[PDB]
Amino acid sequence: ETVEPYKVNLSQDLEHQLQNVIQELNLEIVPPPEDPFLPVVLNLGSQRQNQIGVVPWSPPQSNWNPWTSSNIDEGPLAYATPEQISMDLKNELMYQLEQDHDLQAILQERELLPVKKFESEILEAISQNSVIIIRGATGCGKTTQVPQFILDDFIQNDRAAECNIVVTQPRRISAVSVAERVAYERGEEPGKSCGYSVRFESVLPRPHASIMFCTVGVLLRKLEAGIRGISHVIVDEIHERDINTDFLLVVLRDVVQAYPEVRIVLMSATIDTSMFCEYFFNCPIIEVYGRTYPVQEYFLEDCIQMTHFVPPPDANCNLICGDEYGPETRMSMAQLNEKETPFELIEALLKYIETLNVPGAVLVFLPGWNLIYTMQKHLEMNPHFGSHRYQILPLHSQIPREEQRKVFDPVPSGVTKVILSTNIAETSITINDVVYVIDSCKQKVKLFTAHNNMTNYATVWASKTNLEQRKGRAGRVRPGFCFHLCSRARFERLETHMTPEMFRTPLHEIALSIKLLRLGGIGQFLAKAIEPPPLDAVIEAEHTLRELDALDANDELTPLGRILAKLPIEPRFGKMMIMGCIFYVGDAVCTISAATCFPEPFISEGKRLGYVHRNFAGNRFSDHVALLSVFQAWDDARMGGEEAEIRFCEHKRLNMATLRMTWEAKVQLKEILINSGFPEDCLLTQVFTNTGPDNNLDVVISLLAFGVYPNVCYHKEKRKILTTEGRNALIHKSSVNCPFSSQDMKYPSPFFVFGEKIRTRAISAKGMTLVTPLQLLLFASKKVQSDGQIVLVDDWIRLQISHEAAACITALRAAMEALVVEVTKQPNIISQLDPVNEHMLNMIRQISRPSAAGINLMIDY
Ligand SMILES: Nc1ncnc2c1ncn2[C@@H]1O[C@H](COP(=O)(O)OP(=O)(O)O)[C@@H](O)[C@H]1O
Ligand SMILES: [Mg+2]
């Protein structure tokens, strides 16, 4: 079935050098076996424990900026008394209201919002109780108004200086957009009374009488200092059950016991909030409601029948169909695959909607950007859905806020607004003048399985709660309609609620947070959660952090673990960054790491890459080198001003926003290493060639192999690769390593590390970089067994290599790990390392070279 052992052509000069270094370091060499039926394993090999602790809290004061977490000295507000600040801010606001007519008009829109009438009740509830829950339908105005109500209360009652609100949002798009919206509602830009703080981007508001919208991750990273100088904490959209939100509620519950002066406000959609109420000591529930219209529901049976639709040529619920429908309806529906969504039926539904002769927008719920793009392309093919008749606007996370705000804009009468949206438009935002809803009844979820390291962006069935919420979006302006694209049988076999993220998400990052914040045991703390995670996930987290040496045997945070907890990326990439610093390639490795948090900068449109994009790869057969190369080129082109940058990006077909955000992310990652004590000169930008000899890039590739482990694969032919599991898989179309057409690629090595192992119809390897066999042994393997002439790597691939070489390379890995520990104890030692460590690093540098494994990337053969 599987392939023969790969020939590894290693020179004796290098084989000796390896043995000499291992001699010099005096590392324990696992000797060869006597009989070849004895596979010998070449692999080689504290503070006191806590119990529990609470995050400290303190209220706002005048000489303290809670967003920058520092004193105010230089400014005039260092001495300024609270009363002065309060009165000045009040007078400023009063003057603005009487002068600005556009602001008056905006305030008048605010007063018509359903939540307005509950202003008094909400404010009293907050003042009387440490914790409250505000429950109400989506579109009432919980998110935008409640923080303002609270702030304007403190302003207008001459105590503006005692008000600092933190507002948490599950999404990045929400934290930014809400801040922009609230600012506009107060006649400001973000920076004055409102601000935002997400990962790798922030606009901090003023120190006094200010609202800070943020993601939960940002807030948690700041809590090691404490919740210093905050009057209110608003946790929004709790019903979505974001894992970080659920986690925060655990922390906040401990806070309100020890510090009952703080105010917590939980805000929720129309769901059963018993859980949350009971969790927070039977806190009050303030109900919020407004204008609602009855919405007529339809299902796939109904939709097919009234459109007379006919398609092309769990159990299948499209086979099941009641006998109060036509024979054509049964026959037609039975041809539809449930695992697909019927794009042509949606097209038909749009055409049916305009025969009703009632003008209004159509909100179409689709799982991900792919099915939005596919639906969008489908429509614009047909001339009927053109500029004269239709305004088709996509709404997902990965488009500029320029285009996102267009969904709220009105349209000329005669044109119908169609929004192709994700679940963002389910409970988090409310698009206006929506009369019709087409619902796919799907969700998009990350399902990660640790055993095989498989990522699945799975399209899954939504809950009854989801379908009811999506149905509710149609009836805010007038009686609406909702077209569910699931069978009436399927509806019955839907779960009532989605699985919360706490049940199905890796917990290693939350585990690091727990230890950073000194909240006690990982298992102990997560047991107190509203709905605790499964045991295996906790064990998996503990296992992951032990492998990295983030935790010691006592499960206490090591110096290395402290750095990984501070870095807002995957811990494994954090460690790779640290290794990069040791090798003086920290900038490149920080660039690689940053880019994992954002979309691909290449605008490929889901196709194979063209000439321009592939050239960036050089002769390295690497998507990561391509990334680094576009950053080198982009940074050069950016020298000549903003317009020169734009032209470069749209000439090279690059997403300029992605490159900018990634750069800024890199700067902040570097910032945190500097503070942790890493020297400046191991994090400098370093020019590199992607074609010629370059040992700096060699090391990056070696370090990349560590980061993405255990994503390794072996090329057979065309696009077929073998995974770690043993199963076969495809090269992703995006890759520079994907054959452009017929001409097969002559890879100098069959081994590739890669970013994601994606589950779809088949196993796909995305973001692929070629590595040599030596790099495989060094950084892209845990377990290796030698019989004398053949080596077995992680019980999936075999190599024909010297025993001594394999054991020496495995010893280097152990030596490097030992140094990483020593370095994290005292990071500044990389400035001047003793000769023996430099000898170890130099040998790894040599092993990272293509020529080390008898490869020459110059001669394409
Ligand atoms: N960017 C925006 N443009 C136009 N209207 C908006 C925008 N953001 C929010 N709104 C409107 O503000 C109102 C309240 O929305 P929001 O505060 O998000 O409600 P909730 O969180 O209670 O569901 C709604 O009518 C919504 O359409
Ligand atoms: Mg809301």
Numbering used by the authors: 270 to 314, 322 to 589, 606 to 1153
Lines quoted from the article behind this entry:
DHX9 [DExH-box helicase 9, also known as RNA helicase A (RHA) or nuclear DNA helicase II (NDH II); EC 3.6.4.13] is a DExH-box RNA helicase which exhibits unwinding activity for both DNA and RNA substrates. DHX9 has been implicated in several biological processes, including regulation of transcription, translation, replication, RNA splicing and processing, and DNA repair.
Because the initial efforts to crystallize human DHX9 were unsuccessful, mammalian orthologues were investigated. Interestingly, the cat and dog DHX9 constructs were found to have higher melting temperatures (dog DHX9, 58.7°C; cat DHX9, 60.6°C) than the human construct (57.4°C) and the melting temperatures of all constructs increased by 1–2°C in the presence of nucleotide and magnesium (data not shown). Crystals were obtained in the presence of ADP and Mg2+ for both cat and dog DHX9. Streak-seeding greatly improved the crystallization reproducibility and the diffraction quality of both proteins. As a result, structures were solved at 2.97 and 2.71 Å resolution for dog and cat DHX9, respectively. Both proteins crystallized in space group P43212 (one molecule per asymmetric unit) with extremely similar unit-cell constants, despite differences in pH, salt type and the amount of salt in the crystallization conditions. The second molecule in the human structure superimposes with a symmetry mate of cat DHX9 and similar packing interactions between human and cat DHX9 crystals were also observed in the extended space. The Mg2+ and nucleotide interactions described for human DHX9 are also conserved in the dog and cat DHX9 structures. Cat and dog DHX9 had 22 and 23 residue differences, respectively, from the human protein construct and many of the changes were predicted to be in surface residues.
